[PDB]
């Protein structure tokens, strides 16, 4: 199992409010976060650090129930952000997305958890499947529907989140298992990737067996197409 990760300002933004973490020691979990609000940079850093620390501490005890483990990790992160909101008034609106992959000990089942509009994709025998459903008002519209015209981007938002970490009224944390097969790739990415690259283009770059090149190619391609935002990817080869 190989894994690569990469973040980039893009072409327009002056700072990077994304963050990510790869468990390089044991390759059990992987995190991407897309902050908003300077920062923004603080929210996404808090999310990544607290989810990581929570998982590091509680993985041995709770890996049998990863839904509880991941929910408690996200809430740990959420409160750490709110507590830094409750305190600091300038950074009172700060927030972030998060997407997390937690692998089971065996390595053939990946628990996918997210809040926001960063994505987890799985790639398998040239088929790219988006796993997570965007917490945006526009996505959940189409996902009923109607407004099924897509069509969806661009509207006013488009960019507006229906869920993010850093809100006291955080109820929805989406967690779902996916089964893994040798040869799969997992992609975690901020919307800076998917706002520039169609799913067809992404699938092309995830066909590259060398995950370092794949990740580098994905970021390079997102800048070529415009790079209007921070862009972060973690590419896992199963
Ligand atoms: Ca952002
Ligand atoms: Ca967006
Ligand atoms: Ca973004
Ligand atoms: Ca473009």
mmCIF file of N, CA and C in Angstrom, residues 90-204:
data_model
loop_
_atom_site.group_PDB
_atom_site.id
_atom_site.type_symbol
_atom_site.label_atom_id
_atom_site.label_comp_id
_atom_site.label_asym_id
_atom_site.label_seq_id
_atom_site.Cartn_x
_atom_site.Cartn_y
_atom_site.Cartn_z
ATOM 1 N N UNK A 90 -12.621 37.779 16.509
ATOM 2 C CA UNK A 90 -12.294 37.988 15.103
ATOM 3 C C UNK A 90 -12.474 36.697 14.312
ATOM 4 N N UNK A 91 -11.814 35.627 14.758
ATOM 5 C CA UNK A 91 -11.966 34.287 14.197
ATOM 6 C C UNK A 91 -13.198 33.564 14.736
ATOM 7 N N UNK A 92 -14.330 34.269 14.861
ATOM 8 C CA UNK A 92 -15.569 33.676 15.359
ATOM 9 C C UNK A 92 -16.321 32.878 14.306
ATOM 10 N N UNK A 93 -16.105 33.177 13.029
ATOM 11 C CA UNK A 93 -16.803 32.529 11.931
ATOM 12 C C UNK A 93 -16.001 31.389 11.314
ATOM 13 N N UNK A 94 -14.775 31.155 11.785
ATOM 14 C CA UNK A 94 -13.908 30.180 11.143
ATOM 15 C C UNK A 94 -14.551 28.800 11.142
ATOM 16 N N UNK A 95 -14.181 28.007 10.145
ATOM 17 C CA UNK A 95 -14.822 26.723 9.955
ATOM 18 C C UNK A 95 -13.981 25.920 8.998
ATOM 19 N N UNK A 96 -14.335 24.646 8.861
ATOM 20 C CA UNK A 96 -13.595 23.850 7.893
ATOM 21 C C UNK A 96 -14.404 22.632 7.502
ATOM 22 N N UNK A 97 -14.086 22.108 6.317
ATOM 23 C CA UNK A 97 -14.530 20.777 5.984
ATOM 24 C C UNK A 97 -13.555 19.770 6.563
ATOM 25 N N UNK A 98 -13.971 18.509 6.532
ATOM 26 C CA UNK A 98 -13.017 17.432 6.743
ATOM 27 C C UNK A 98 -13.495 16.208 5.975
ATOM 28 N N UNK A 99 -12.561 15.471 5.391
ATOM 29 C CA UNK A 99 -12.815 14.121 4.928
ATOM 30 C C UNK A 99 -11.754 13.243 5.544
ATOM 31 N N UNK A 100 -12.163 12.078 6.009
ATOM 32 C CA UNK A 100 -11.273 11.139 6.671
ATOM 33 C C UNK A 100 -11.512 9.762 6.085
ATOM 34 N N UNK A 101 -10.424 9.033 5.855
ATOM 35 C CA UNK A 101 -10.470 7.597 5.624
ATOM 36 C C UNK A 101 -9.786 6.909 6.797
ATOM 37 N N UNK A 102 -10.493 5.981 7.443
ATOM 38 C CA UNK A 102 -9.927 5.092 8.449
ATOM 39 C C UNK A 102 -10.006 3.653 7.945
ATOM 40 N N UNK A 103 -8.853 3.014 7.764
ATOM 41 C CA UNK A 103 -8.805 1.624 7.324
ATOM 42 C C UNK A 103 -8.962 0.681 8.508
ATOM 43 N N UNK A 104 -9.616 -0.455 8.270
ATOM 44 C CA UNK A 104 -9.609 -1.501 9.279
ATOM 45 C C UNK A 104 -8.237 -2.175 9.325
ATOM 46 N N UNK A 105 -7.980 -2.863 10.439
ATOM 47 C CA UNK A 105 -6.701 -3.552 10.619
ATOM 48 C C UNK A 105 -6.346 -4.410 9.406
ATOM 49 N N UNK A 106 -7.340 -5.101 8.831
ATOM 50 C CA UNK A 106 -7.061 -5.999 7.712
ATOM 51 C C UNK A 106 -6.638 -5.246 6.456
ATOM 52 N N UNK A 107 -7.191 -4.059 6.222
ATOM 53 C CA UNK A 107 -6.808 -3.271 5.066
ATOM 54 C C UNK A 107 -7.649 -3.487 3.828
ATOM 55 N N UNK A 108 -8.817 -4.111 3.963
ATOM 56 C CA UNK A 108 -9.743 -4.316 2.854
ATOM 57 C C UNK A 108 -11.088 -3.631 3.087
ATOM 58 N N UNK A 109 -11.195 -2.788 4.117
ATOM 59 C CA UNK A 109 -12.418 -2.057 4.424
ATOM 60 C C UNK A 109 -12.015 -0.671 4.901
ATOM 61 N N UNK A 110 -12.546 0.367 4.253
ATOM 62 C CA UNK A 110 -12.177 1.753 4.534
ATOM 63 C C UNK A 110 -13.409 2.530 4.971
ATOM 64 N N UNK A 111 -13.384 3.036 6.202
ATOM 65 C CA UNK A 111 -14.469 3.845 6.731
ATOM 66 C C UNK A 111 -14.262 5.290 6.312
ATOM 67 N N UNK A 112 -15.263 5.844 5.654
ATOM 68 C CA UNK A 112 -15.196 7.156 5.032
ATOM 69 C C UNK A 112 -16.090 8.085 5.830
ATOM 70 N N UNK A 113 -15.511 9.151 6.378
ATOM 71 C CA UNK A 113 -16.268 10.084 7.206
ATOM 72 C C UNK A 113 -16.068 11.490 6.680
ATOM 73 N N UNK A 114 -17.143 12.276 6.622
ATOM 74 C CA UNK A 114 -16.894 13.635 6.167
ATOM 75 C C UNK A 114 -17.941 14.613 6.672
ATOM 76 N N UNK A 115 -17.516 15.874 6.700
ATOM 77 C CA UNK A 115 -18.403 17.020 6.878
ATOM 78 C C UNK A 115 -17.938 18.062 5.882
ATOM 79 N N UNK A 116 -18.821 18.449 4.957
ATOM 80 C CA UNK A 116 -18.523 19.522 4.034
ATOM 81 C C UNK A 116 -18.539 19.046 2.590
ATOM 82 N N UNK A 117 -17.731 19.701 1.760
ATOM 83 C CA UNK A 117 -17.732 19.449 0.321
ATOM 84 C C UNK A 117 -16.364 19.029 -0.199
ATOM 85 N N UNK A 118 -15.462 18.624 0.689
ATOM 86 C CA UNK A 118 -14.321 17.832 0.265
ATOM 87 C C UNK A 118 -14.822 16.415 0.032
ATOM 88 N N UNK A 119 -14.116 15.675 -0.810
ATOM 89 C CA UNK A 119 -14.659 14.433 -1.325
ATOM 90 C C UNK A 119 -13.720 13.275 -1.035
ATOM 91 N N UNK A 120 -14.312 12.086 -1.000
ATOM 92 C CA UNK A 120 -13.594 10.826 -1.090
ATOM 93 C C UNK A 120 -14.082 10.118 -2.356
ATOM 94 N N UNK A 121 -13.155 9.737 -3.207
ATOM 95 C CA UNK A 121 -13.460 8.914 -4.365
ATOM 96 C C UNK A 121 -12.770 7.567 -4.220
ATOM 97 N N UNK A 122 -13.346 6.544 -4.854
ATOM 98 C CA UNK A 122 -12.669 5.264 -5.013
ATOM 99 C C UNK A 122 -12.605 4.953 -6.497
ATOM 100 N N UNK A 123 -11.458 4.438 -6.918
ATOM 101 C CA UNK A 123 -11.148 4.122 -8.306
ATOM 102 C C UNK A 123 -10.827 2.634 -8.363
ATOM 103 N N UNK A 124 -11.402 1.928 -9.335
ATOM 104 C CA UNK A 124 -11.265 0.472 -9.375
ATOM 105 C C UNK A 124 -11.576 0.007 -10.785
ATOM 106 N N UNK A 125 -10.594 -0.607 -11.446
ATOM 107 C CA UNK A 125 -10.751 -1.082 -12.822
ATOM 108 C C UNK A 125 -11.358 0.012 -13.703
ATOM 109 N N UNK A 126 -10.672 1.156 -13.733
ATOM 110 C CA UNK A 126 -10.995 2.340 -14.527
ATOM 111 C C UNK A 126 -12.322 3.007 -14.152
ATOM 112 N N UNK A 127 -13.057 2.496 -13.162
ATOM 113 C CA UNK A 127 -14.317 3.096 -12.723
ATOM 114 C C UNK A 127 -14.058 4.003 -11.513
ATOM 115 N N UNK A 128 -14.296 5.312 -11.680
ATOM 116 C CA UNK A 128 -14.177 6.298 -10.603
ATOM 117 C C UNK A 128 -15.541 6.546 -9.968
ATOM 118 N N UNK A 129 -15.656 6.288 -8.666
ATOM 119 C CA UNK A 129 -16.915 6.437 -7.946
ATOM 120 C C UNK A 129 -16.729 7.421 -6.795
ATOM 121 N N UNK A 130 -17.506 8.507 -6.810
ATOM 122 C CA UNK A 130 -17.527 9.424 -5.675
ATOM 123 C C UNK A 130 -18.259 8.772 -4.512
ATOM 124 N N UNK A 131 -17.602 8.712 -3.361
ATOM 125 C CA UNK A 131 -18.161 8.011 -2.220
ATOM 126 C C UNK A 131 -19.033 8.931 -1.380
ATOM 127 N N UNK A 132 -18.513 10.110 -1.036
ATOM 128 C CA UNK A 132 -19.207 11.054 -0.164
ATOM 129 C C UNK A 132 -20.189 11.906 -0.969
ATOM 130 N N UNK A 133 -21.233 12.386 -0.300
ATOM 131 C CA UNK A 133 -22.175 13.318 -0.913
ATOM 132 C C UNK A 133 -21.960 14.698 -0.307
ATOM 133 N N UNK A 134 -21.689 15.681 -1.170
ATOM 134 C CA UNK A 134 -21.376 17.042 -0.751
ATOM 135 C C UNK A 134 -22.455 17.596 0.170
ATOM 136 N N UNK A 135 -22.029 18.102 1.328
ATOM 137 C CA UNK A 135 -22.875 18.917 2.203
ATOM 138 C C UNK A 135 -22.884 20.357 1.685
ATOM 139 N N UNK A 136 -23.603 20.544 0.588
ATOM 140 C CA UNK A 136 -23.940 21.863 0.078
ATOM 141 C C UNK A 136 -25.443 21.938 -0.129
ATOM 142 N N UNK A 137 -25.983 23.154 -0.032
ATOM 143 C CA UNK A 137 -27.403 23.341 -0.302
ATOM 144 C C UNK A 137 -27.741 22.923 -1.722
ATOM 145 N N UNK A 138 -26.839 23.189 -2.662
ATOM 146 C CA UNK A 138 -27.129 22.893 -4.058
ATOM 147 C C UNK A 138 -27.094 21.394 -4.313
ATOM 148 N N UNK A 139 -26.195 20.667 -3.645
ATOM 149 C CA UNK A 139 -26.133 19.227 -3.869
ATOM 150 C C UNK A 139 -27.360 18.534 -3.306
ATOM 151 N N UNK A 140 -27.732 18.860 -2.070
ATOM 152 C CA UNK A 140 -28.880 18.197 -1.471
ATOM 153 C C UNK A 140 -30.172 18.579 -2.180
ATOM 154 N N UNK A 141 -30.186 19.724 -2.867
ATOM 155 C CA UNK A 141 -31.291 20.075 -3.745
ATOM 156 C C UNK A 141 -31.429 19.022 -4.837
ATOM 157 N N UNK A 142 -30.412 18.920 -5.701
ATOM 158 C CA UNK A 142 -30.397 17.918 -6.767
ATOM 159 C C UNK A 142 -30.674 16.523 -6.227
ATOM 160 N N UNK A 143 -30.243 16.242 -4.998
ATOM 161 C CA UNK A 143 -30.382 14.916 -4.411
ATOM 162 C C UNK A 143 -31.746 14.701 -3.774
ATOM 163 N N UNK A 144 -32.795 15.316 -4.316
ATOM 164 C CA UNK A 144 -34.141 15.029 -3.835
ATOM 165 C C UNK A 144 -35.097 14.644 -4.995
ATOM 166 N N UNK A 145 -35.350 15.487 -6.007
ATOM 167 C CA UNK A 145 -34.858 16.844 -6.170
ATOM 168 C C UNK A 145 -35.951 17.853 -5.851
ATOM 169 N N UNK A 146 -36.267 18.746 -6.785
ATOM 170 C CA UNK A 146 -35.696 18.720 -8.119
ATOM 171 C C UNK A 146 -34.419 19.537 -8.188
ATOM 172 N N UNK A 147 -34.466 20.650 -8.922
ATOM 173 C CA UNK A 147 -33.266 21.372 -9.347
ATOM 174 C C UNK A 147 -32.244 20.435 -9.996
ATOM 175 N N UNK A 148 -32.699 19.251 -10.428
ATOM 176 C CA UNK A 148 -31.835 18.205 -10.965
ATOM 177 C C UNK A 148 -31.009 18.675 -12.152
ATOM 178 N N UNK A 149 -31.371 19.808 -12.760
ATOM 179 C CA UNK A 149 -30.509 20.447 -13.747
ATOM 180 C C UNK A 149 -29.148 20.688 -13.115
ATOM 181 N N UNK A 150 -28.104 20.138 -13.729
ATOM 182 C CA UNK A 150 -26.765 20.276 -13.177
ATOM 183 C C UNK A 150 -25.754 20.911 -14.143
ATOM 184 N N UNK A 151 -25.893 22.202 -14.472
ATOM 185 C CA UNK A 151 -26.971 23.081 -14.010
ATOM 186 C C UNK A 151 -26.712 23.700 -12.633
ATOM 187 N N UNK A 152 -26.284 22.850 -11.698
ATOM 188 C CA UNK A 152 -26.158 23.246 -10.303
ATOM 189 C C UNK A 152 -25.057 24.285 -10.120
ATOM 190 N N UNK A 153 -23.857 23.989 -10.607
ATOM 191 C CA UNK A 153 -22.778 24.964 -10.595
ATOM 192 C C UNK A 153 -22.665 25.587 -11.980
ATOM 193 N N UNK A 154 -22.731 26.916 -12.048
ATOM 194 C CA UNK A 154 -22.771 27.753 -10.852
ATOM 195 C C UNK A 154 -24.131 28.399 -10.582
ATOM 196 N N UNK A 155 -24.535 28.368 -9.313
ATOM 197 C CA UNK A 155 -25.624 29.191 -8.806
ATOM 198 C C UNK A 155 -25.011 30.207 -7.852
ATOM 199 N N UNK A 156 -25.799 30.818 -6.962
ATOM 200 C CA UNK A 156 -25.176 31.635 -5.903
ATOM 201 C C UNK A 156 -24.233 30.819 -5.038
ATOM 202 N N UNK A 157 -24.707 29.664 -4.585
ATOM 203 C CA UNK A 157 -23.881 28.642 -3.953
ATOM 204 C C UNK A 157 -24.560 27.338 -4.371
ATOM 205 N N UNK A 158 -23.955 26.364 -5.063
ATOM 206 C CA UNK A 158 -22.523 26.214 -5.355
ATOM 207 C C UNK A 158 -21.674 26.214 -4.081
ATOM 208 N N UNK A 159 -20.982 27.324 -3.820
ATOM 209 C CA UNK A 159 -19.906 27.359 -2.834
ATOM 210 C C UNK A 159 -20.382 27.340 -1.379
ATOM 211 N N UNK A 160 -21.683 27.331 -1.096
ATOM 212 C CA UNK A 160 -22.156 27.477 0.279
ATOM 213 C C UNK A 160 -22.311 26.103 0.914
ATOM 214 N N UNK A 161 -21.747 25.944 2.111
ATOM 215 C CA UNK A 161 -21.778 24.676 2.818
ATOM 216 C C UNK A 161 -23.027 24.568 3.672
ATOM 217 N N UNK A 162 -23.626 23.385 3.671
ATOM 218 C CA UNK A 162 -24.705 23.086 4.598
ATOM 219 C C UNK A 162 -24.207 22.483 5.909
ATOM 220 N N UNK A 163 -22.959 22.013 5.942
ATOM 221 C CA UNK A 163 -22.339 21.501 7.155
ATOM 222 C C UNK A 163 -20.860 21.858 7.097
ATOM 223 N N UNK A 164 -20.279 22.187 8.251
ATOM 224 C CA UNK A 164 -18.838 22.382 8.360
ATOM 225 C C UNK A 164 -18.448 22.212 9.821
ATOM 226 N N UNK A 165 -17.190 21.854 10.047
ATOM 227 C CA UNK A 165 -16.702 21.771 11.415
ATOM 228 C C UNK A 165 -16.475 23.177 11.938
ATOM 229 N N UNK A 166 -16.712 23.363 13.233
ATOM 230 C CA UNK A 166 -16.731 24.689 13.809
ATOM 231 C C UNK A 166 -18.105 25.294 14.002
ATOM 232 N N UNK A 167 -19.158 24.479 14.049
ATOM 233 C CA UNK A 167 -20.520 24.925 14.316
ATOM 234 C C UNK A 167 -21.056 24.197 15.545
ATOM 235 N N UNK A 168 -21.631 24.957 16.483
ATOM 236 C CA UNK A 168 -22.232 24.326 17.650
ATOM 237 C C UNK A 168 -23.405 23.437 17.251
ATOM 238 N N UNK A 169 -24.126 23.802 16.196
ATOM 239 C CA UNK A 169 -25.257 23.008 15.710
ATOM 240 C C UNK A 169 -24.822 21.975 14.670
ATOM 241 N N UNK A 170 -23.797 21.191 15.015
ATOM 242 C CA UNK A 170 -23.291 20.121 14.159
ATOM 243 C C UNK A 170 -24.005 18.827 14.528
ATOM 244 N N UNK A 171 -24.877 18.354 13.642
ATOM 245 C CA UNK A 171 -25.577 17.092 13.845
ATOM 246 C C UNK A 171 -25.125 16.014 12.872
ATOM 247 N N UNK A 172 -25.041 16.345 11.587
ATOM 248 C CA UNK A 172 -24.746 15.365 10.547
ATOM 249 C C UNK A 172 -23.234 15.180 10.415
ATOM 250 N N UNK A 173 -22.750 13.980 10.743
ATOM 251 C CA UNK A 173 -21.437 13.495 10.310
ATOM 252 C C UNK A 173 -21.703 12.242 9.494
ATOM 253 N N UNK A 174 -21.414 12.294 8.195
ATOM 254 C CA UNK A 174 -21.657 11.147 7.329
ATOM 255 C C UNK A 174 -20.510 10.158 7.440
ATOM 256 N N UNK A 175 -20.832 8.916 7.802
ATOM 257 C CA UNK A 175 -19.852 7.839 7.892
ATOM 258 C C UNK A 175 -20.387 6.630 7.144
ATOM 259 N N UNK A 176 -19.577 6.073 6.243
ATOM 260 C CA UNK A 176 -19.995 4.896 5.523
ATOM 261 C C UNK A 176 -18.793 4.029 5.190
ATOM 262 N N UNK A 177 -18.928 2.711 5.303
ATOM 263 C CA UNK A 177 -17.823 1.820 4.951
ATOM 264 C C UNK A 177 -17.833 1.549 3.467
ATOM 265 N N UNK A 178 -16.645 1.363 2.919
ATOM 266 C CA UNK A 178 -16.497 0.831 1.576
ATOM 267 C C UNK A 178 -15.555 -0.359 1.663
ATOM 268 N N UNK A 179 -15.839 -1.389 0.875
ATOM 269 C CA UNK A 179 -14.953 -2.538 0.762
ATOM 270 C C UNK A 179 -13.877 -2.236 -0.274
ATOM 271 N N UNK A 180 -12.676 -2.750 -0.038
ATOM 272 C CA UNK A 180 -11.524 -2.482 -0.883
ATOM 273 C C UNK A 180 -11.047 -3.754 -1.581
ATOM 274 N N UNK A 181 -10.478 -3.574 -2.764
ATOM 275 C CA UNK A 181 -9.868 -4.654 -3.515
ATOM 276 C C UNK A 181 -8.469 -4.233 -3.925
ATOM 277 N N UNK A 182 -7.538 -5.183 -4.003
ATOM 278 C CA UNK A 182 -6.195 -4.864 -4.499
ATOM 279 C C UNK A 182 -6.280 -4.166 -5.843
ATOM 280 N N UNK A 183 -5.495 -3.112 -6.005
ATOM 281 C CA UNK A 183 -5.541 -2.308 -7.201
ATOM 282 C C UNK A 183 -6.405 -1.066 -7.090
ATOM 283 N N UNK A 184 -7.306 -1.015 -6.115
ATOM 284 C CA UNK A 184 -8.070 0.203 -5.884
ATOM 285 C C UNK A 184 -7.155 1.384 -5.615
ATOM 286 N N UNK A 185 -7.657 2.573 -5.920
ATOM 287 C CA UNK A 185 -7.116 3.797 -5.351
ATOM 288 C C UNK A 185 -8.212 4.532 -4.603
ATOM 289 N N UNK A 186 -7.818 5.189 -3.520
ATOM 290 C CA UNK A 186 -8.670 6.110 -2.792
ATOM 291 C C UNK A 186 -8.113 7.507 -3.005
ATOM 292 N N UNK A 187 -9.000 8.456 -3.260
ATOM 293 C CA UNK A 187 -8.641 9.855 -3.390
ATOM 294 C C UNK A 187 -9.402 10.633 -2.317
ATOM 295 N N UNK A 188 -8.687 11.429 -1.526
ATOM 296 C CA UNK A 188 -9.295 12.464 -0.691
ATOM 297 C C UNK A 188 -8.903 13.799 -1.296
ATOM 298 N N UNK A 189 -9.853 14.710 -1.426
ATOM 299 C CA UNK A 189 -9.494 15.944 -2.090
ATOM 300 C C UNK A 189 -10.377 17.072 -1.603
ATOM 301 N N UNK A 190 -9.812 18.275 -1.613
ATOM 302 C CA UNK A 190 -10.631 19.454 -1.419
ATOM 303 C C UNK A 190 -11.284 19.845 -2.737
ATOM 304 N N UNK A 191 -12.342 20.657 -2.635
ATOM 305 C CA UNK A 191 -13.080 21.074 -3.820
ATOM 306 C C UNK A 191 -12.248 21.940 -4.763
ATOM 307 N N UNK A 192 -11.066 22.403 -4.338
ATOM 308 C CA UNK A 192 -10.141 23.016 -5.267
ATOM 309 C C UNK A 192 -9.704 22.084 -6.382
ATOM 310 N N UNK A 193 -9.798 20.774 -6.168
ATOM 311 C CA UNK A 193 -9.499 19.829 -7.233
ATOM 312 C C UNK A 193 -10.701 19.707 -8.174
ATOM 313 N N UNK A 194 -11.862 19.387 -7.610
ATOM 314 C CA UNK A 194 -13.051 19.048 -8.372
ATOM 315 C C UNK A 194 -13.744 20.264 -8.959
ATOM 316 N N UNK A 195 -13.408 21.472 -8.505
ATOM 317 C CA UNK A 195 -13.912 22.640 -9.209
ATOM 318 C C UNK A 195 -13.140 22.917 -10.490
ATOM 319 N N UNK A 196 -11.986 22.276 -10.686
ATOM 320 C CA UNK A 196 -11.186 22.452 -11.894
ATOM 321 C C UNK A 196 -11.163 21.235 -12.807
ATOM 322 N N UNK A 197 -11.275 20.029 -12.257
ATOM 323 C CA UNK A 197 -11.079 18.791 -12.999
ATOM 324 C C UNK A 197 -12.367 17.990 -12.956
ATOM 325 N N UNK A 198 -12.886 17.638 -14.130
ATOM 326 C CA UNK A 198 -14.021 16.738 -14.183
ATOM 327 C C UNK A 198 -13.628 15.378 -13.627
ATOM 328 N N UNK A 199 -14.649 14.597 -13.256
ATOM 329 C CA UNK A 199 -14.425 13.233 -12.789
ATOM 330 C C UNK A 199 -13.735 12.379 -13.850
ATOM 331 N N UNK A 200 -13.942 12.687 -15.131
ATOM 332 C CA UNK A 200 -13.284 11.905 -16.176
ATOM 333 C C UNK A 200 -11.786 12.157 -16.168
ATOM 334 N N UNK A 201 -11.394 13.430 -16.066
ATOM 335 C CA UNK A 201 -9.982 13.802 -16.014
ATOM 336 C C UNK A 201 -9.313 13.224 -14.768
ATOM 337 N N UNK A 202 -9.963 13.376 -13.604
ATOM 338 C CA UNK A 202 -9.445 12.808 -12.357
ATOM 339 C C UNK A 202 -9.188 11.317 -12.518
ATOM 340 N N UNK A 203 -10.155 10.596 -13.092
ATOM 341 C CA UNK A 203 -10.008 9.154 -13.264
ATOM 342 C C UNK A 203 -8.765 8.823 -14.083
ATOM 343 N N UNK A 204 -8.474 9.636 -15.095
ATOM 344 C CA UNK A 204 -7.271 9.439 -15.903
ATOM 345 C C UNK A 204 -6.033 9.459 -15.020
#
